[PDB]
Design a protein around this nucleic acid. Structure first.
Ligand SMILES: [Mg+2]
Ligand SMILES: [Zn+2]
Ligand SMILES: [Zn+2]
Lengths: 93, 113, 1083, 78, 284, 326
DNA sequence: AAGAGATTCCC
RNA sequence: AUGUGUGCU
DNA sequence: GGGAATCTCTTCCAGCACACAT
């Protein structure tokens, strides 16, 4: 099983909506620095060798455990296309 | 025009035939056995099709990326990689008109009907 | 060791030489044995005088023939890509119409492959073999009319494919229709060709069924002697009426189209012994004075009326009665092709008469070397009928020779007609195994010959039957044909007998192929032994009567892939054939004559023949099998010992002291274990690895060619142009790597270059191992082929020994296939109260659903076997039974338990608990003593077992014992792929190649459909381009991951932009409109 | 009409171009400017674009996700 | 009637050196060759003289030659001089056929990052995961492992790391641990032999197990009909994070616990499981 | 266990039922090794009444046979007579097998397998202890002499031979159709790939009434439709107009779970509703596609079908997979 | 190669 | 790169 | 104008393998 998927599949209209959401989140989370995460202080995914999942092992794990909390919001039309891309590379390294 | 939606198929006039063409294959020449460079304005010439090399031209007045969308003054070589070669068409101006056998040989004669 | 047989049916005759169908056929097929004046007209010789006296001034004649000294020996052919053939000489003279007789004996008009004493012909440097065929025996037959159950139709089959297909049908109207080629016509006209008068005909046919009216007539139509020809031609061959028909006569005559099956053999014996009475010549043409004569046509008509009327002695032919189906043996296939070649040779000699200069022209102007060549050449190398000799072990090879096929030259069997033909017909009893047929698709079309069964020249299988005198069984063995078997009443071999006299009031018998229980008198014959029903592989299965037919199939088809194990064991429970198997299969080497031992070397055994002769024997250690296994002979007698004639001297690749050893005798406990024996997967002791129980020896042959290209002559040198001396530490010879070295995936095997970049030969991603032999065929080659352009080849024999690992395929004789799952160490393995662990763990859930109780029984006997140290011989249906096995078990128990009872130990607390539970189970009887309870359990093959990893006893007794288990020819390392990014092809960007990577896995419509079904558009698209044929994006991803960034998707689909270009090539225009109809750039 | 007689004549000529005789599928549609509504799967798969279903469905494909830290920064200049 | 003949781009017709100096030229080059040989022989011909036989026969020759380029085979069969009696794969043939540009992507295409092996029970692992041998894991995840090896004190940079994994005895603890650090939540696709229904391919999370064969969970056997007696299963890796996302959500085994055919659990207890359970819940 | 998993699925969830599953997979194994369930030669306990069930058969046929020789019945008639004789004999012996266990040997290693969902099959267990029935002749007929023995005891030479006839046919029936696996799925996919659920709801209100009564068992006798069929013609679907029955009102346009169908059948047993109104792809509006309400449930689970599912492909495959089993 | 469809010829 | 053949699924 | 016959074109199946041959 995966981190509380029944909450997820229900959190959206179509099950594929969730896939696209998780995906694009992981993408912009990896591309614009792994710092625009919305749950990095204590409630954050971790690993086993050291505890170094705090940095950048998996991009999807983070998305799935991110949406679990009401920190983000999906939708069809929310932000103008170009502007989003630009300001997402501005506000982060 | 950024989102490809649907595709249509139709016959092409001489004009539209030549429109995708960037020059005429006026020779039956392929490649010299010695100089692997293209031959006499035939099938592989950089003038009609594209530069056999990457971003570099024929002679070598312009060689790098800085002048990306520029054509040389003395020889016409505008350059992307070995892709522009593989994406540009040439043509052949037949002496006497010839009909497309596709429309001739068929179960229903597209022209004989 | 030692042996105890149970079988009490006296095999009154030993089993015939197994590879005889391949050998005897070939020897009789040519007069190379006996002098060219001796007998044996048939085979090659026959083929001669069929197309030999080619009358025109052209009259050749058969003036003897001889050949048979090969270009190169048995093993040198195998190494140099040649054929163990012999040049064909054959003496040929010419006689002109006028005077003068010019002769020139030997003409190098081609070659002809010889056969090893085992039954294989080394063609094109590869051991190949031709199987036997089954088809309808060419003759006259009477089968019912398809749509009309009222009348019947005749039949005249004559092979080959060229040669008419004649049917005779009494058309419901009344008139009789001749069917030739396909067309029909009034048969009475052809009757008139042969010079029949209305009267004579009216007599002969008129005899009984008035139906003669149907044909006797045609007064206006049949009142002309030789005009019936002139008219038949008009109505059959739409053309000109001169003498062309008087010549087509010959075509429905002799020599040509109809069958040349000798005067007295096939056509004769078949015809007479079945129908009619007489045959006057191979086929139907006696033409004294141009006139015609016939003998078959009239009995065919006579028999037709007889059947389609009253009862002149029951006239019903059965299409697959087997007494109607010949078996084309190897020698027949060969001689047939030889005839085919001689035919075109004859066409040439006909053609050349017009290009003759003067008179003489015997040697050089006429007889050439192409038709015979084309005949004998394309056959052994292109025929669907000849294949790779399956040499997994000697037994498998033995099977592959004795197998019969239907699939053949097209003229007989097709690959689009089955389901009905494949089924076990009645007459296959004793002649063909109803079990051996290889499973899966194409099933039933391939059936091995039964054990005691053997071809009788005529083609039909013959069964050994013991005839009986009234009430006493005769010690006479008559080999009967299917057509003759049904004409009697035969008893089973299980029938109670006193010496040779029946001892039961009711005898189980079979009439015309059906169970009927009769009296001791009506017996006239008897089955020799129940071993005659099955093909030897099925005869290798103990307690066969206790296995399902489906299971026994696989069981009989498992041996055919039993990898020869370095330390192999003979079965602990066998049938008795093994010892014969190894000797008839030419596995090991036996003694030829009585005497003592001279020199037991690991390379030779010298023998003391009492006739002052010591003959030399090679013992051959590592000879790569055709399959990939290894063939080893290891000595078995010590220096200074007296041997006997026919006694072994060494062991074959699959023999232990002269028995068939195709695997191991491991102590198996049948019980569920964690999940490790889920399905048919098999748990295994680590112990078996510690004492190398399952270990093979494979030799992968690599190669390279030195083609002399013009841009730059390729050449082999001990020089690798670019980097390290470390890689050349193995390169000993100048170009060749050393022998005895260790090569690994990526190691350099051969060094050579071409136009200077390195194009050498390295070890593929699979595995190398240890080099054992290196062959090199230079330009100065003492008589070899060598491919065009190539200057010299370099082949390497890299051997390696592989142990039983997780993933290898394991199975038995009873038929249980199954992979190995986990190799639990010795500690945490089920072990008896005695310090003895178990070797293999089989899931019981695999037993009931397939009904193969055989394993259970071999295990039961295997218990007594393990504790008494003695194997057993249990024949097919006269093998062991319950009272016997239980009895022996009772004996072994005394050892297994008495040892403890004496030693100062007794009934363990655990044993007590297990017994207590076994009571409520209902295996033991309540009331006895613990020792007696354990005795009862030990009788049923069951016994207390400890968990091993806990020490808690498995609450419930389970059956343990030593069963026979082989390792199958499949392994894992043979099938292993794991490449991420590697070679592609210039011609196609789809990845494949074995340089440093294996090969990209195939993606079919069935996979794409699954990904599509899920809705994984990204994974699918990524699969169809990014990791396949799109090159632009391939390196995009490959660069991306290198830096640790996400895989970039492809913005512009590649296969689209290419197709646009391809579609614009023609007069077609591909316009990629926008959402609201506007042209959109793609580039 | 049967399954195969049906599928043999889908308007999506991209499909029939694959299985059926290519030359006639292209010829018959070339004369009459046939707009291939790139809707069918097998249709849209020959090309290489993502497939018209699942994670590629129009209903889903065009979707965006952001957090408050960016939602605000965008909220300002809007 | 086209009076101008469009010529295909170069690389779509690769005049390419293969080996030893052997030149594979797509037959389209040899087809465009004679078209020019007759074209310029017709145009030049109108200039000098103008015989009806010569010129008209020439027109027929042209009309034939261009047809050869378009649809080869409708009129005899143009062949390269005695050596190959094959007709040249014309433009019409570069499409229609099993190996074309319509049947192309639909059924073919050999994947890149992939493999296969013999199936074995995987008792000690859950539906979420599966047993995959070490060697496979290293090879399949070569590049990820490279980068992460650069992230740690395992290798200087990319190239030196590529040279690190070159020979088979170089694989040290460092590399393996890093290799576990590259996967984690990463999921792989496992394919069956004849794949038939949707559940024919299941995603699992790789577990670096020894041995050599692929280890698979018992329950999903009945799913894509797999028995342990010598069968072969394949394996891929959804590289893109989008592909990873869809794979571990809709293609994962633990999330597909019902058959799309009918509302029946297709991961129910099976051969051994049931026997064990039934044995312990009955009365005496 | 299967039904338990199905219920716990739609009750406890998906990710949970996974864990339940693996718990079963663990414990069941671990216990199956402690049980000691094995297969011995004695384990296949032969029924006690064998000799009598045969005796009363033999002493029966002996009479019937005579009736032929006297000239009472015809050829065909006695052929069918022996048929009925052994047809009933084997079936009766089977009961002796399955009862001998249940009575005297409750925990029979061969019994517990065939009983629970483990390997094993009724008529198969009949073959090990009881006797094999009459086998098939090469043609469509049957041998008038059945294999009167069992695999446990010695199955005789000739008997094996007469069983081989059907035994080989089996292979053809399965192996000749291992290749047909790619044929039906192919044909169906070609006409379906265009279909995908890419809609929320359509503007139509057309339905079908899936009948709850099979009219055609005997001549013309109306009666309850099969326990199975109804379930697959009503599960996870959508109504077109509210229908109240047993005492609870079913919502309009409601995604019926299995229990909905259950209580519906119960209500139909009393004489309430003969049919049920339902949305189906058969009557959608979407040209290329099918909407959400029209399709229904299935999404590898019991959820409303997601918007954008590749339904056509899935359906084609689900009709294709068990094609070869025919 | 075998089956189906289309075209041509004869009634 | 296609055909023949066998082996396994 | 219709019907029958003959010729031509198209379909030609689940996966891997090992082989050989052209
Ligand atoms: Mg299998
Ligand atoms: Zn320049
Ligand atoms: Zn709808």
């Amino acid at each position: 099983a995966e981190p509380g998927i029944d909450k997820l599949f229900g959190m959206v209209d179509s099950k594929y909506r969730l896939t696209v959401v998780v995906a694009k989140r992981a993408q912009q989370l990896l591309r614009h620095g792994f710092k625009n995460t919305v749950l990095e202080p204590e409630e954050r995914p971790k690993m086993q060798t050291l505890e170094g999942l705090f940095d950048d092992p998996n991009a999807v794990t983070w998305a799935m455990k991110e949406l679990l909390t009401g920190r983000l919001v999906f939708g069809e039309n929310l932000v103008p296309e170009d502007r989003l891309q630009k300001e997402m590379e501005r506000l982060y390294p | 025009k950024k989102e490809v939606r649907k595709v249509r198929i139709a016959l092409a006039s001489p004009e539209k035939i030549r429109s995708w063409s960037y020059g005429e294959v006026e020779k039956p020449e392929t490649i010299n056995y010695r100089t692997l460079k293209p031959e006499r304005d035939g099938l592989f010439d950089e003038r009609i099709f594209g530069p056999i090399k990457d971003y570099e031209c024929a002679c070598g007045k312009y060689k790098r990326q800085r002048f990306e969308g520029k054509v040389c003054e003395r020889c016409g070589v505008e350059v992307t990689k070995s892709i522009v070669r593989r994406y540009r068409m040439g043509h052949i101006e037949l002496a006497t008109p010839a009909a497309h056998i596709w429309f001739v040989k068929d179960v229903p004669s597209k022209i004989g009907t | 060791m030692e042996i105890k047989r149970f079988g009490r049916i006296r095999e009154v005759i030993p089993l015939p030489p197994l590879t005889e169908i391949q050998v005897e056929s070939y020897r009789r097929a040519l007069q190379a044995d006996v002098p060219p004046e001796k007998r044996e007209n048939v085979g090659i010789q026959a083929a001669f005088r069929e197309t030999f006296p080619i009358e025109e001034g052209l009259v050749l004649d058969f003036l003897e023939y001889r050949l048979g000294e090969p270009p190169f020996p048995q093993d040198e052919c195998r190494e140099k890509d040649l054929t163990y053939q012999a040049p064909l000489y054959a003496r040929l003279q010419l006689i002109h119409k006028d005077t003068g007789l010019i002769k020139e004996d030997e003409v190098f008009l081609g070659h002809i492959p010889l056969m090893t004493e085992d039954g294989s012909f080394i063609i094109n440097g590869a051991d190949r073999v031709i199987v036997s065929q089954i088809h309808r025996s060419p003759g006259v037959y009477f089968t019912p009319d398809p749509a009309r159950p009222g009348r019947y139709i005749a039949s005249i089959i004559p092979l080959p494919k060229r040669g008419p297909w004649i049917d005779l049908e009494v058309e419901p109207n009344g008139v009789v229709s001749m069917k030739v080629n396909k067309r029909k016509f009034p048969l009475v006209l052809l009757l008139r060709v042969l010079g029949y008068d209305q009267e004579t005909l009216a007599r002969e046919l008129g005899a009984y069924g008035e139906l003669v009216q149907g044909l006797m007539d045609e007064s206006v139509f049949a009142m002309r002697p030789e005009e019936a020809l002139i008219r038949l031609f008009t109505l059959l061959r739409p053309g000109d009426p001169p003498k062309r028909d008087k010549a087509v006569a010959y075509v429905y005559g002799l020599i040509a189209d109809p069958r040349r099956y000798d005067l007295g053999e096939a056509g004769r014996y078949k015809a007479e012994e079945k129908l009619g009475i007489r045959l006057s010549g191979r086929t139907l043409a006696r033409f004294e004075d141009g006139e015609f004569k016939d003998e078959v046509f009239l009995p065919t008509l006579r028999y037709l009326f007889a059947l389609t009327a009253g009862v002149p002695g029951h006239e019903v032919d059965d299409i697959d009665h087997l007494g109607n189906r010949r078996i084309r043996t190897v020698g027949e296939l060969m001689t047939d092709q030889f005839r085919v070649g001689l035919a075109r040779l004859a066409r040439g000699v006909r053609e050349r008469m017009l290009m003759g200069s003067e008179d003489s022209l015997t040697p050089a102007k006429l007889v050439n070397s192409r038709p015979l060549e084309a005949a004998i050449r394309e056959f052994f190398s292109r025929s669907q009928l000849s294949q790779f000799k399956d040499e997994t072990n000697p037994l498998s090879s033995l099977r592959h020779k004795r197998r019969i096929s239907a699939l053949g030259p097209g003229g007989l069997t097709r690959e689009r007609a089955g389901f009905d033909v494949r089924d076990v017909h009645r007459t296959h009893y004793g002649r063909i195994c109803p079990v051996e047929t290889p499973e899966g698709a194409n099933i039933g079309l391939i059936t091995s010959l039964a054990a005691y069964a053997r071809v009788d020249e005529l083609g039909f299988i013959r069964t050994p039957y013991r005839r009986v005198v009234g009430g006493v069984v005769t010690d006479e063995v008559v080999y009967m044909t299917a057509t003759e078997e049904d004409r009697y009443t035969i008893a089973q071999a299980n029938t109670p007998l006193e010496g040779n006299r029946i001892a039961a009031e009711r005898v189980v018998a079979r009439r015309k192929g059906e169970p009927v229980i009769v009296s001791p008198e009506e017996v006239e014959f008897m089955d020799v032994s129940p071993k005659q029903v099955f093909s030897v592989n099925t005869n290798l299965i103990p307690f066969l009567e206790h296995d399902d037919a489906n299971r026994a199939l696989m069981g009989s088809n498992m041996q055919t892939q039993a990898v020869p194990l370095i330390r192999a064991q003979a079965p602990v429970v066998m049938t008795g054939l093994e010892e014969r198997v190894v000797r008839d299969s030419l596995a090991a080497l036996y003694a030829e004559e009585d005497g003592e031992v001279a020199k037991v070397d690991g390379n030779r055994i010298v023998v003391r023949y009492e006739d002052g002769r010591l003959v030399e024997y090679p013992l051959r250690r590592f000879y790569r099998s055709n399959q990939g296994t290894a063939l080893d002979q290891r000595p078995r007698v010590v220096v200074g010992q007296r041997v006997r004639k026919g006694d072994l001297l060494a062991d074959g690749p699959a023999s232990e002291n002269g028995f068939l050893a195709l695997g191991q005798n491991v102590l198996v406990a049948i019980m569920p274990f964690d999940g490790y024996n889920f399905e048919d997967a098999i748990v295994i002791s680590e112990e078996l690895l510690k004492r190398d129980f399952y270990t093979s020896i494979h030799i992968e042959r690599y190669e390279i060619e030195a083609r002399d290209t013009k841009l730059g002559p390729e050449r082999i040198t001990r020089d690798i142009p670019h980097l390290s001396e470390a890689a050349l530490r193995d390169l000993d010879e100048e170009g060749v790597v050393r022998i005895g070295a260790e090569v690994k995936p990526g190691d350099i095997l051969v060094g050579r270059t071409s136009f200077v970049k390195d194009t050498s030969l390295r070890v593929p991603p699979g595995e190398g191992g240890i080099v054992v032999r290196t062959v090199r065929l230079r330009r100065g080659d003492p008589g070899v082929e060598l491919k065009p352009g190539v200057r010299e080849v370099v082949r390497v024999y890299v051997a390696q020994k592989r142990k039983l690992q997780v993933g290898d395929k394991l199975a038995n004789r009873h038929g249980n296939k199954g992979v190995v799952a986990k190799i639990l160490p010795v500690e945490d393995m089920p072990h008896l109260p005695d310090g003895t662990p178990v070797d293999v763990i089989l899931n019981p859930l695999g037993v009931p659903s397939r009904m193969n109780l055989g394993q259970i029984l071999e295990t039961h006997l295997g218990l007594a076997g393990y504790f008494l140290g003695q194997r057993y011989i249990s024949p097919i249906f006269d093998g062991a039974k319950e009272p016997e096995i239980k009895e022996l078990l009772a004996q072994a128990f005394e050892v297994y338990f008495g040892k403890r009872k004496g030693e100062g130990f007794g009934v363990d607390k655990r044993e007590v608990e297990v017994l207590r539970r076994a009571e409520k189970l209902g295996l033991v009887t309540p009331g006895k003593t613990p020792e007696e309870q354990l005795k009862e359990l030990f009788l049923q093959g069951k016994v207390v077992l400890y968990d091993g990893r806990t020490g808690e006893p498995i609450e419930g007794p389970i059956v343990v014992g030593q069963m026979f288990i082989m390792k199958l020819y499949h392994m894992v390392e043979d099938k292993m792929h794991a490449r991420s990014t590697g070679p592609y092809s210039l011609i196609t960007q789809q990845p494949l190649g074995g340089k440093a990577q294996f090969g990209g896995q195939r993606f079919g419509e069935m996979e794409v459909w699954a990904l599509e079904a899920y809705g994984a558009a990204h994974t699918l698209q990524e699969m169809l381009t990014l990791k396949s044929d799109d090159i632009e994006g391939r390196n995009a991803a490959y660069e991306a991951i290198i830096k640790g960034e996400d895989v970039p998707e492809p913005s512009v689909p590649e296969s689209f932009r290419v197709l646009v270009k391809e579609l614009q090539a023609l007069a077609l225009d591909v316009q990629t409109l926008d959402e609201k109809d506007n042209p959109v750039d793609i580039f | 009409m049967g399954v195969t007689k049906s599928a043999l004549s889908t308007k999506s000529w991209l499909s029939a171009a694959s299985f059926q005789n290519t030359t006639h599928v292209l010829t018959e549609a070339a004369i009459a400017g046939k707009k291939d509504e790139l809707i069918g799967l097998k249709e849209n798969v020959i090309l290489g674009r993502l497939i018209p279903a699942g994670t590629g469905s129009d209903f889903v494909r065009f979707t965006q996700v952001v957090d408050q830290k960016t939602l605000k920064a965008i909220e300002e200049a809007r | 009637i086209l009076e101008a003949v469009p010529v295909l781009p170069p690389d779509l017709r690769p005049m390419v050196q293969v080996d030893g100096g052997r030149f594979a030229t797509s037959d389209l080059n040899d087809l465009y060759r004679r078209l020019i040989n007759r074209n310029n022989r017709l145009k030049k011909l109108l200039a000098q003289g103008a015989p009806e036989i010569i010129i008209r026969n020439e027109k027929r020759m042209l009309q034939e030659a261009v047809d050869a380029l378009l649809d080869n085979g409708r009129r005899g069969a143009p062949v390269t001089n005695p050596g190959s009696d094959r007709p040249l794969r014309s433009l019409t043939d570069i499409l229609s056929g099993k190996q074309g540009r319509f049947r192309q992507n639909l059924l073919g295409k050999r994947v890149d990052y992939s493999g296969r092996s013999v199936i074995v029970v995987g008792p000690q692992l859950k539906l979420h995961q599966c047993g995959l041998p070490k060697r496979m894991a290293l090879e399949l995840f070569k590049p990820f492992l490279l980068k992460k090896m650069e992230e740690k004190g395992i290798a200087p940079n990319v190239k030196a790391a590529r040279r690190m994994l070159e020979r088979q005895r170089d694989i040290k603890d460092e590399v393996w641990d890093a290799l576990e650090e590259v996967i984690h939540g990463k999921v792989v696709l496992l394919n069956r032999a004849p794949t038939l229904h949707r559940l024919g391919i299941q995603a699992f999370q790789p577990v670096l197990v020894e041995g050599q064969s692929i280890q698979l969970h018992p329950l999903v056997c009945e799913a894509f009909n797999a028995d342990f007696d010598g069968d072969q299963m394949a394996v891929h890796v959804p590289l893109s994070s989008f592909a990873q996302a869809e794979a571990r959500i809709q293609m994962l085994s633990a999330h597909n616990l019902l058959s799309p055919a009918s509302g029946e659990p297709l991961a129910k207890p099976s051969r051994d499981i049931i026997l064990g359970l039934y044995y312990i819940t009955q009365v005496r | 266990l299967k039904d338990l998993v199905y219920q716990a699925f739609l009750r406890l969830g998906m990710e949970k039922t996974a864990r339940l599953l693996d718990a079963l997979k663990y414990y069941g194994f671990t216990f199956s090794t402690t049980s000691g369930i094995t297969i011995g030669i004695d384990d296949a306990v032969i029924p006690e009444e064998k000799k009598q069930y045969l005796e009363e058969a033999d002493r029966k046929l002996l009479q019937i046979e005579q009736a032929y020789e006297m000239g009472f019945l015809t050829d065909r008639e006695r052929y069918d007579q022996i048929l009925q004789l052994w047809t009933e004999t084997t079936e009766k012996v089977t009961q002796a097998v399955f009862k001998n266990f249940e009575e005297n040997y409750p925990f029979n290693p061969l019994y517990v397998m065939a009983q629970s969902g483990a390997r094993g099959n009724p008529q198969q267990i009949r073959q090990l202890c009881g006797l094999r029935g009459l086998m098939q002749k090469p043609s469509g007929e049957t041998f008038e002499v059945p294999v009167r023995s069992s695999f446990r005891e010695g199955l005789t030479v000739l008997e094996y031979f007469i069983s081989s006839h059907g035994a080989r046919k089996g292979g053809a029936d399965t192996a000749l159709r291992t290749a047909d696996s790619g044929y039906l799925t192919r044909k169906l996919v070609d006409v379906t790939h265009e279909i995908v659920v890419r809609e929320a709801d359509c503007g139509t209100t057309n339905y079908i009434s899936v009948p709850l009564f099979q009219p055609d068992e005997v001549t013309r006798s109306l009666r309850l439709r099969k326990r199975a069929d109804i379930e697959a013609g009503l599960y996870g679907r959508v109504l077109a107009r509210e229908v109240e029955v047993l005492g609870v009102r079913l919502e309009e346009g409601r995604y019926l779970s299995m229990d909905d169908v259950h209580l519906l059948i119960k209500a139909a047993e009393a004489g309430e509703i003969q049919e049920v109104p339902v949305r189906s792809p058969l009557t959608c509006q979407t040209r290329y596609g099918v909407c959400q309400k029209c399709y229904g449930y299935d999404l590898s689970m019991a959820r409303p079908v997601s918007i954008g599912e590749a339904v056509g492909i899935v359906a084609a495959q689900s009709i294709g997979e068990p094609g070869t089993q025919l």
